[PDB]
């Protein structure tokens, strides 16, 4: 790896610089290098990792949706035949997206998840595993589509089980996991009732636990609670 010769601390420092400069591809490459040092990640470091790859894949997904939409239009009756280019370029972006997802899933499997013993780390990584299988599922059309969806579901479910046992209902990781698993249900698993039920129950259980929190924890938890409410408003 091209980051093999750089100090772990230097990679973390540069990931932060890359974040300030909105250089998310660089940020991701630095964090990959850091993970590949083989030491566990701290809370801050886990966040750096997730921020970097979320921004990179988020851009790829946005582009994929633009291209897939143009491609769909081209296959409507009355559309002039324009050749293979739209499919080719959608495929190019798709392949790049899949590569990023496989990279992240690779880091999680080798060996972030297996070394993660504390709830905050294990739930966070299992959420990411669910998230990156979900992105693979968004573009899947083949023999393995069902297995990709189940891989997402399984990772989210394991994360859910741990989060309910080991974290308070207001914990931002628990909230974020629930938000994304709810989206999984709505957009990937064709289960809008499960999505709505999950978002509602998570919101209400968190509401009931806000009284235990500091002002700063309250701000963190309520921010994610609002995203649950936003989705519920979108869906009802």
């Amino acid at each position: 790896g091209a980051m093999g010769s750089m100090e772990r601390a230097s990679l973390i420092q540069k990931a932060k610089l890359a974040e300030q400069a909105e250089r998310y591809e660089d940020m991701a490459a630095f964090m990959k290098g850091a993970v590949e040092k083989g030491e566990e990640l701290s809370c801050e470091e886990r966040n750096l990792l997730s921020v970097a790859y979320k921004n990179v894949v988020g851009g790829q997904r946005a582009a994929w949706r633009v291209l897939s939409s143009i491609e769909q239009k081209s296959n409507e009756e009355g559309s002039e035949e324009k050749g293979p280019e739209v499919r080719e370029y959608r495929e190019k972006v798709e392949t790049e997206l899949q590569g990023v997802c496989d990279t992240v899933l690779g880091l999680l499997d080798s060996h972030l998840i297996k070394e993660a013993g504390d709830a905050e780390s294990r739930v966070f990584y299992l959420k990411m595993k669910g998230d990156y299988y979900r992105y693979l599922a968004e573009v899947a059309t083949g023999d393995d589509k069902k297995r990709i969806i189940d891989s997402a579901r399984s990772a989210y479910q394991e994360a859910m089980d741990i989060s309910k046992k080991e974290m308070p209902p207001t914990n931002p990781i628990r909230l974020g996991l629930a938000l994304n698993f709810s989206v999984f249900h709505y957009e990937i698993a064709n289960s809008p009732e499960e999505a709505i039920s999950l978002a509602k129950t998570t919101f209400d259980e968190a509401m009931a636990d806000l009284h235990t929190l500091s002002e700063d924890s309250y701000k963190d938890s309520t921010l994610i609670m609002q995203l649950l409410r936003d989705n519920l408003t979108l869906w009802t």
């Binding site: 998230d131 994304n180 989206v183």
Partner: peptide, 5 residues
């Protein structure tokens, strides 16, 4: 699209 984090 819906919100995720």
């Amino acid at each position: 699209f819906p919100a995720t984090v």
